Amino acid sequence: MDPSMGVNSVTISVEGMTCNSCVWTIEQQIGKVNGVHHIKVSLEEKNATIIYDPKLQTPKTLQEAIDDMGFDAVIHNPD
Template structure:
């Protein structure tokens, strides 16, 4: 397992946070996700045989938010 913190821009409220947590959290290989509106980021624990930081950032972008690989 790996963990990553991705920058997420474009969220304005709790429902944005929830929709990202639900959709990304339900992807196979995503173990845990916590999204912060204040910090504009998503902390994700994932199975690295399923995902890379790039694939996770793309999944968030695909939902219509901007995602930046910062770390």
């Protein structure tokens, strides 16, 4: 099989930040919320890629994550 260590990846766009603390502080919590392996942001393209263990969490937490801070960020992955 090839479940890739039972994990999934979710990418989202961004258009409302200011200082590194913006996405980086957000990526820190979303990465410190559970079994989040790694993540990364790129103001160059206004977006950020992060993963998350579906066996422990899911794409819903990510939805609640943005709704928790406010950074107007939109996802681009259906599942």
